[PDB]
Amino acid sequence: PNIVLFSGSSHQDLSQRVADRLGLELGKVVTKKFSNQETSVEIGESVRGEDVYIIQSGCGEINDNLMELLIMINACKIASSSRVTAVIPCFPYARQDKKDKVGESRAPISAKLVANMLSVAGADHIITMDLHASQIQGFFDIPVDNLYAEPAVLQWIRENIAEWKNCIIVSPDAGGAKRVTSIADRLNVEFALIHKERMVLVGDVKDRVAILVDDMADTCGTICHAADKLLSAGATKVYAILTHGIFSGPAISRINNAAFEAVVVTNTIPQEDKMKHCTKIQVIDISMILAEAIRRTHNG
Amino acid sequence: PNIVLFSGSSHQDLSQRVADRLGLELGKVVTKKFSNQETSVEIGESVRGEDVYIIQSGCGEINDNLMELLIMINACKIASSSRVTAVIPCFPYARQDKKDKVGESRAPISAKLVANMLSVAGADHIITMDLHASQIQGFFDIPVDNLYAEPAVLQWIRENIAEWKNCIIVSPDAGGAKRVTSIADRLNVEFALIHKERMVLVGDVKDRVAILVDDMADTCGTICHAADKLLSAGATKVYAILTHGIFSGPAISRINNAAFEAVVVTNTIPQEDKMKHCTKIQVIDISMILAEAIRRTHNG
Amino acid sequence: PNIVLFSGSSHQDLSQRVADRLGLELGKVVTKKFSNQETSVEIGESVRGEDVYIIQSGCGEINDNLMELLIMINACKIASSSRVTAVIPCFPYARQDKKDKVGESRAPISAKLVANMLSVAGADHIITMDLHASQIQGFFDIPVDNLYAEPAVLQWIRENIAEWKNCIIVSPDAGGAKRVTSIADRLNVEFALIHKERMVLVGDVKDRVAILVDDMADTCGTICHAADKLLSAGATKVYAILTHGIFSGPAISRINNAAFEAVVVTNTIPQEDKMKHCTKIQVIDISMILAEAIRRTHNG
Amino acid sequence: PNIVLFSGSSHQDLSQRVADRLGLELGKVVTKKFSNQETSVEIGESVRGEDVYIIQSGCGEINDNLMELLIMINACKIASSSRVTAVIPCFPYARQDKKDKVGESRAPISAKLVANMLSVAGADHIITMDLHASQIQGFFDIPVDNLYAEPAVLQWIRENIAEWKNCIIVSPDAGGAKRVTSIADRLNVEFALIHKERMVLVGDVKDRVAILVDDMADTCGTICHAADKLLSAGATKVYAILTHGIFSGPAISRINNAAFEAVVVTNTIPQEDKMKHCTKIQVIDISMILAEAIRRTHNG
Amino acid sequence: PNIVLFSGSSHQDLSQRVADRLGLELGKVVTKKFSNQETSVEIGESVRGEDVYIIQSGCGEINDNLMELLIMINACKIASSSRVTAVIPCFPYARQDKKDKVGESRAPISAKLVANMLSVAGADHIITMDLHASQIQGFFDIPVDNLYAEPAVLQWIRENIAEWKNCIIVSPDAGGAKRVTSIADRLNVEFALIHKERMVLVGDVKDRVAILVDDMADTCGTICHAADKLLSAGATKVYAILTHGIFSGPAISRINNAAFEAVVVTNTIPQEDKMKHCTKIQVIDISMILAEAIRRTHNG
Amino acid sequence: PNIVLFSGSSHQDLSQRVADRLGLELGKVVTKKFSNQETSVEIGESVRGEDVYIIQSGCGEINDNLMELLIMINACKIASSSRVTAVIPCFPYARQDKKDKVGESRAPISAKLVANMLSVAGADHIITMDLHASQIQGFFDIPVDNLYAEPAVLQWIRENIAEWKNCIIVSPDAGGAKRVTSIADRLNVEFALIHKERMVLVGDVKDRVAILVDDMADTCGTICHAADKLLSAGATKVYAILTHGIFSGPAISRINNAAFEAVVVTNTIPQEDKMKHCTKIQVIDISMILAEAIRRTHNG
Ligand SMILES: Nc1ncnc2c1ncn2[C@@H]1O[C@H](COP(=O)(O)OP(=O)(O)O)[C@@H](O)[C@H]1O
Ligand SMILES: Nc1ncnc2c1ncn2[C@@H]1O[C@H](COP(=O)(O)OP(=O)(O)O)[C@@H](O)[C@H]1O
Ligand SMILES: Nc1ncnc2c1ncn2[C@@H]1O[C@H](COP(=O)(O)OP(=O)(O)O)[C@@H](O)[C@H]1O
Ligand SMILES: Nc1ncnc2c1ncn2[C@@H]1O[C@H](COP(=O)(O)OP(=O)(O)O)[C@@H](O)[C@H]1O
Ligand SMILES: Nc1ncnc2c1ncn2[C@@H]1O[C@H](COP(=O)(O)OP(=O)(O)O)[C@@H](O)[C@H]1O
Ligand SMILES: Nc1ncnc2c1ncn2[C@@H]1O[C@H](COP(=O)(O)OP(=O)(O)O)[C@@H](O)[C@H]1O
Ligand SMILES: O=P(O)(O)OC[C@H]1O[C@@H](O)[C@H](O)[C@@H]1O
Ligand SMILES: O=P(O)(O)OC[C@H]1O[C@@H](O)[C@H](O)[C@@H]1O
Ligand SMILES: O=P(O)(O)OC[C@H]1O[C@@H](O)[C@H](O)[C@@H]1O
Ligand SMILES: O=P(O)(O)OC[C@H]1O[C@@H](O)[C@H](O)[C@@H]1O
Ligand SMILES: O=P(O)(O)OC[C@H]1O[C@@H](O)[C@H](O)[C@@H]1O
Ligand SMILES: O=P(O)(O)OC[C@H]1O[C@@H](O)[C@H](O)[C@@H]1O
Ligand SMILES: [Mg+2]
C-alpha cells in the first residue's frame, strides 16, 4: 500500500534522484513506441491498491511525452490503483493560459485542454514546480501543488555571488515584476525593471552587478536583450537565474556569444547535453523539493 | 427567438442603459425576498426558445446577488430557454484565484467555486469586463468573453488631461506593471513603478504629472499611499483611473482628505451614492461595450 | 484519521453542544468577511486524510451562511480530506421543492439548486433534521440522512402536558396530516384537522386540550389562526409544538398577544434572542440525535 | 423538423388517440423480442433533426416497458435526433421516492434510479400526468411537466353526479388531504378524512353522498375499506374517482363484490380488459391534455 | 470490512457454490415483486464500509433480472458501502455491440446502454465470463475483468474424448475462427471452418471426430446445421462445446432429434431444468474461476 | 450556417479532394509548431454558428497529429461553433481496443482513452473509415459513422482482375475471416483461410488466383508470409488488397522483393512518397465516400 514510483521516457536522471531520496527505486515499466509511432506502455509489476506516483516532465517532444503520461495514468487506473498522482516538473502548454487579446484570432486555451485530459485519464493529484501562471491551479478540480524554486535561487545568490548585499534584481519583461520584487525583498535589496517595445529601463544599474530573474527561457529572445541593455546602461556584469531552462532553437548559440557570467537553471528540464555546449550554464538540484512534496502527499 | 434581456436587483441603471442601447426593454421579473431572507425569483413572461441575457454585477451584498443570479439562471433553464448568458460586469470572488503561498493555511479557490456554480446552474456563456486575472477564462468550460475598458481610459486621458503628451503612468503595486505598461505604449509615453514593503519608487516623476492606473479599489489602501509617495517624490499632481471602483470600508473618507485631482471609474459598480459624498469621483460609461458584446454573441 | 468537527458562523451553541457530546472540540477555523462583503474562510489545522464534519444551519441570512458552507466544503476538499460531510440542521430553500401549479409563472426549484451546489462543492454525505419534504432525499446522488425529532416531541408531551391521555393533535393545514396522524397513533389518541380558505375544522375539539403540530413556523401566519379557530370551537387551551422555529417577521409579536400556553421548538435554529422577548417559547435539545448520527456515519 | 411521434408496445390506444388529436400518425417502429427475452427496437423512418416524442406508460410488465423506452430513446439519440422527449403517463417506481423511516432496512430510491436512467439514455424532456409526489420533478435536471387530471374529475363530478352541490369529498388515507381539499375548495363544498390503524373517520358523512378521491389504486386495499367505513357511518352511496387505475392482483374481484356506484379512472393505464369484467369502472379521456402539452413543448 | 456476498433471484445455485468456495454465505436480501410487477429489494444486514459483491446472471427474463441488479447496486451504494462489484456471468445485450451495417435501420447499441446504466447505478467493478466481444471492456470506465472458460474446455476435451490427439475443431460460423484457432493451437492439432449462405466447408473432416466450439447457443440455429454438414462431409461423430448455453425457443427439441454425442456447457446460465429434457447436455463448473477472480479483486 | 471545412497538417491531398467534391474550399487555419515542439493552432476566419468539419488522419507522427486535432476541436468549440465534427480516416490507437489476455501485464485501452479525449475536447460527431473493431463505435457517447471501403474493393477486383469469376479470397490471419467471407459472398465465389503458429492453410488455392484481403498493413509481417505460403501451395499469382496502408518500418523493402503484382490501398493514409519507391502499390480514391457522409450528416 506504500509508494510505487514510476518514471517516463523523458528526464530519467531526476526520476532516479527522486527515487533515491525516497529510499526506493523506479517500478518496472517498458515505454517504447510501436512501428507506426504509437506509444507502447507495459507495466511489469502490480499496482493494485498502491499509491502510484508518475514523474513526466514536459520537455523534449511535448506531445509524445504527454501521450505517454496519459496512457500511463490510464493503465494504472484501470489496473485498480488506489490513487494515481502525476508529478509534472514543467507543465506543458502552460504559456497558452488565456484567449489572448485583440489580434489573436480564435486562439485556444491549451493549458485547460491538458488539464481536462489529465482529469479524464484518471489523475487524482497534480504536483508542479513553478507554474507559469499560478491561476492554472484553478484549471483542475483535483488538488494541485505549485512548488517554488525561490529558496534555491536565494541560496545560490548568497553562496556564489559574493557581492549579493549590494546588487539589484532585474526583470527582463513587465510580467516578471512580482517574482523579481519578492526576491529583492527576500534578499533585502532594491530592484529595477526592463520592458521592450525599443528597450526601456527604470532603475539605477550604474557600476553595480545585476541579476536577471525569469520563470523560463525558450529561445533566449529575452534575457539576452536585457543583458545588452543592462551593459549599455552601466552594469559591470550581468547574471541570469531561471527556473525552467528550455534552451530551444538557437538558444545555446545566443548564450555562447553573450556576456553572461553564469546562466543558472534547475533539474526540471534535462540540462546534460545543453551544458556540454555551453560553460555558462549551471544547474541547481530540485529533487529534494519534489521528494518532500511526494512524502507530504503520501503520509498525510 | 430574439434577445430577451433580464436585470438583477443590483445595478438597475446599467441594465436600463444596456437595454436602451439594444433598442429593447428589460423583461418582467420580480426579485424580492421572503420573510426569512430567502431569494424569490418570479419570471413573468415566456422565455421558451429565447436567447436569455441576464446582467448581474458582483457588488453590494455579494452573496445575495450571486444567489439571485444563480436562481434566475436555473429558472430560465428549467423554463426551456434556448441559451442563457450571464453578463457579470464585476466577477465576484475574483481576487481568490490561487491557493496563495506559504502562510495562507489551506485557503480555497473561490473563483473556481463560483465558476462551477455558474456552470451547474445552467449558464451557456459568460461576459465579464476586465477580469482580475485573465486566466479565470480557463476556470470555465463554456466560452468566456473578457472585455477591456482600456480604450475608454485612453480616451478620457486624451480629452480631459491636456498635458497627456508629457505625463507618466504609475502602477501602485508590482502586479500592475502589465496594464500600466500597455497604456504607456498606447499613449507613446514612459512609465514608472511603485512597490510597498516602506514605499519604493523607480522612475522619473519629477515636476510632472502622473496617473495611477489599477484594476480596482476596495478600500483605497493602495493608490492613496502611491499618491502620497508620488507627491513626496516631486509630482505636481496625481490622477487615479480605475476600472472597478468598489469604494468599500473607509474609502470615501480617504479620497476626500487626499490630494487627488480626479478619481476615475466606470459603470460596472453603481457609483451614484458614492459620487454624492465625493466630488473627485468621475464615471465613464461602458454600456456600449457590453451591448456590442451582447450583439456579437447573439447575431453570430 | 478520526473525526474533525468544524462549525460555521451561525449557531455556535449547537455546534459546541454536538462537540461536547462527541468528546471533542471544534477545529480552528476563522470565518470573517472582507471589506466588500465577501466570505473569508481560513482553516488553521490540518485536514489531510481526516473525516471532516461541518455543521451549518440554514438560519439568519440564508445566502451568506450557504456561501460560507460551500466555501468551507470546497476548502476542505481541495486540502486532501478523506471525506467531507455537511450537517445542515435546517435545509435552506426547502419550501421550494416543486415547480408549483397553474399561476406560479416559471418558478424555479431552489432545493435542487442547493443540492447541486453541495454536490459540486465536494460534499460526500448530508445529514438533515426533519426535511420539509422527505423526497428531497432524491435531490442528491450522495447518501442523505433525514433525522426525525418526533421522539423528543412525544417525550415533551408526556412529561409536561399532564392530560396527554385525553388530548387531541391538530394539524394547522392540509399538508400536515401525516405528521399529526403518526403522532396521534404513537400516543394512542385521536386527532383533528384544520384547513384555511375561511377556517374550516373537522374534529371534536370540545372542552379538551388541543396540540398544534407543524414542521416549521416562519411568520406564524398559520398556527395563530388555528389557535383562534380552536378557541372559538371550544378548546380549553391550545399548545403548539414545532421542529424548526424561524420566528421571522412579526412572529414574536403575534405569539406575544396570543393565547398559546406554550410554543415548543427545537435547537435547530438559534432561539436565544427570540426566547428573551417571549416567555411562551421553550426549546428541546436535539444535539444528541445529530451526535449519534455523526457517530453512526463515522464508525461504520 | 416537425413532430415525429413514436409509440411503445404498451398502451397503443392512447398513443393512437394522441396522434389523431395532433393530426399525425405514429412512426414506423417494430418493437418485438428476441428468442431470449431481449428487447428488439428497429426504427424504420428517419429521425435525423426531428423533434421526437415517445409515449410509453409504466403499466403491465414495468421492467420490460421501461427497458423498451430506454432502448428506444437511446436509438433515437444515436440517430442524430434534435431532441427526444419521453411522455410517461404513469411514472414507474413512483411510490419509491423516499428512503422510508425506521424499519425499512436499506431500502433504495427507485424513482431517482429511473430518473438517472432516463437522463443517461438521452432524454431531453419529460411529460408526466399526476405524479405520485410532485417533488419527483426535482429528481431530474431536464425540464419536467407534471400534468393534472383534476379538471376532468371536476367535469365528471358536475355532469354525472346530480347532487354534487351537497356532497362531500373523502380521502381514503392521510396523504390524500391536499388533493381532496383542493377538489372540495374548487367545487365550493366541504370535505372529510379517513385514516387506517382500525378505521377512523373525521367528518359529517351522514345521509349524504360521499366521493373517494385518490391518486391511484393498485390492489384496492384502500378505497374499499374507506367505502365500508363510509357505509357504516351513514353514507347513502359511495363513489370513487382515481387518476391511475392499476387494478392489479385481486382488484377487480374486490370492486365486483363492493357497493361502489361507480369507479372512475383515466386513460393513463389501459382499462379495456379490466372494464369488461367490471361494469362499475368508467374511463375519462386525457389524450387532449397530453396532446396540448406536446404542442406547447414543440411550438415554443 | 471483508467480503459481503449477495445473490439475485436468478441462478441461486451458482451463487451458493461461489459462496461455499469463498467460505462464506450469502447476505440477507429479500428480492420479491410488488403487485404491479415492480421489483422489491430489501437488504436485511449492514453493508456500511463493506466490499459488496453481487452475482446476477443475464438469464431467464433479462429485463427483470437487470432491473433487480441495478436496484440492488443502487441500494448498496446509498447505504454507504465502500465498493460495489457486479459479477455478471452472462452479460445481457452483449450481441448488440455495433450499429450493424447497411440494412439495419437505426439500430441501437444496447450493450453500451447497459454499461451506462451499471455505471450510473453505482458499480465500481465488473466481472464477466467470456464476453461476446472483448471490446465491451471499453464500454465501461470502471475496471472490467473478462474471464475465460477455455482451460475448462481443454480439460474436458482431454479427459472425456479419448481420441483428442487426432481430432479437429470446427467453428460453426466465420466469427468463431479466433476461439477455435486458439483451442487448436493449445491442443496441438488442426482445425476447419464452416460458413452459411448454403453451408460451405474448408477442412479435412474425413472419417475423423470433430468438435464444434462457439461462445453461445440461443436457438441452436447454428451448431445443428454445422453438425449436419459435418456428418454429410464424412465426420464419424460430432461434439459441441459451448460457454453460455441459453437453449431458448425450440432448442431442446433440436438437440434431442440430432446426432450430437454430447453438448457441453458451463454453469453461467442455469442448466438444471434443461438437462432433464435432454441427456446430451453436460455441465462444467466455473464457480472456482469466479471465486478466484473475486478473491483477487478483494485482496489486492 | 453552412459547412466550414478545416484540414490538418497531415494528409492535405485528401482534404483538398473532399473540399472539391463538396464544392467548397478549406478554411484559413495556420497549424505550425512553436520553438519547443508545442502545437500552434490559429483559426483565421469566423466559426461562430458554423458546422465545422475537421479532417485529421491518424498517420505520420500519431501523437502530434492527435494533439493538433484536439487543439483544433477545442479552439472551434470555445469560439462558439454550432457543432464540431471530427473526420478521422484512420483512427489512432485502434489496435489497442482490449485489455488483451494472460501475458500482457496491465496493458491499457488506448482507443477508449482517445475516445474520451475527443469527447472532452468538444467533438459532437465522429466519422471513421473501416474501423479496426466495429465495437469501437461503443467507445463514444456521440454518434459514430463507420464507413466501409468494400464497394471500392469489389469494383477494383471486377475491373482490374479479369479472372475474378474463378478466384478465391484468402485471409492472412484468423481474425480476417468475416471480411474475406463477406467479400467472397459479394463476388459469389469461394474462399480459404490462413493461420500462423508455422503457417497453416485450409483451402484449394491450387493453380488458381488468390487475393489477400486485410484491414491494414503496418510492417507487412503478415500478407508477405501468406503470399509465400500461397505460392508454395500452388497459387499462380497472389494479390493483396488493403484499406489502411501504413507501410511503416521495413515494409517497402519487403513488398519490393516479393511476388506481389498489386498491393492495393486507399487514400486514408498518404501514399504519395510510398508509391514512388514501389511500383506494385496502387491507390483507390475514397474521398467520395467521406464527402457523401459529410453531406448526409450536414443536411439531415
Ligand atoms: N511554446 C511556446 N513558444 C512560443 N510562444 C508561445 C508558446 N506558447 C504560447 N506562446 C505564445 O506566447 C504568448 C504568451 O506570452 P506571455 O509573455 O506569457 O504573455 P503575457 O504578456 O500575458 O505574460 C501567447 O500569446 C502565446 O500565443
Ligand atoms: N474581497 C477581498 N477583499 C480583500 N482581500 C481579499 C479579497 N479577496 C481575496 N483577498 C485576499 O487578497 C489577496 C490577493 O491580493 P493580490 O495583490 O491580488 O495578490 P497578488 O500579489 O497575487 O496579485 C489574496 O491572498 C486574498 O487572500
Ligand atoms: N422562505 C419562504 N417564505 C415564504 N414562502 C415561501 C418560502 N419558500 C417558498 N415559499 C412559497 O411557499 C409555497 C410552498 O407552500 P407549501 O404550503 O409548503 O406548499 P404545499 O401546499 O405544496 O405544502 C411555494 O409555492 C413557495 O412559492
Ligand atoms: N408498486 C408497489 N406496490 C406496493 N407497494 C409499494 C410499491 N412501491 C413502493 N411500495 C411501498 O409503499 C410504501 C409507500 O406507501 P405510501 O402510502 O405512498 O407512503 P406515504 O405514507 O409516505 O404516502 C413504500 O414504503 C414502499 O415500500
Ligand atoms: N438476443 C438476441 N437474439 C437473437 N439475435 C440477436 C440478439 N441480440 C442481437 N441480435 C442480432 O444478432 C446480430 C448479431 O449476430 P452476430 O453473428 O453476432 O454478428 P457478427 O456477424 O457481427 O458476429 C445483431 O445484428 C443483432 O441484430
Ligand atoms: N501500432 C501498433 N503496432 C504494433 N502492434 C500493436 C500496435 N497497437 C497495438 N499493438 C499490439 O497488437 C495486438 C493486437 O493484435 P491483433 O491481431 O489485433 O489481436 P487479435 O488477434 O485480438 O485481433 C495488441 O495486443 C497490441 O499489444
Ligand atoms: O523565449 P524567450 O524570449 O527566451 O522567453 C519567453 C518569455 O515568455 C514569457 O512567458 C516568459 O517570461 C519568458 O521569459
Ligand atoms: O483594497 P485596495 O488596497 O484599494 O486595493 C486592493 C488591490 O489588490 C489587488 O488585487 C488590486 O490590484 C487592488 O489594487
Ligand atoms: O409562514 P407560516 O405561516 O408561519 O408557516 C408556513 C407554513 O408553510 C408550510 O410549508 C409549513 O407547514 C408552515 O407551517
Ligand atoms: O394498493 P392500494 O391499497 O389500492 O393503494 C395504494 C395506496 O398507496 C398510496 O401511495 C396511494 O395513495 C394508494 O391509494
Ligand atoms: O442462436 P444460435 O444460432 O444458436 O446462435 C447465435 C450465434 O450468433 C453469434 O452471436 C454466436 O456466435 C452464436 O453462435
Ligand atoms: O503489421 P502487419 O503484420 O503488416 O499487420 C498487422 C496485423 O494486425 C492486425 O491488427 C491486422 O489484421 C493486421 O493484418
Ligand atoms: Mg405546511
Ligand SMILES: [Mg+2]
Ligand atoms: Mg396514499
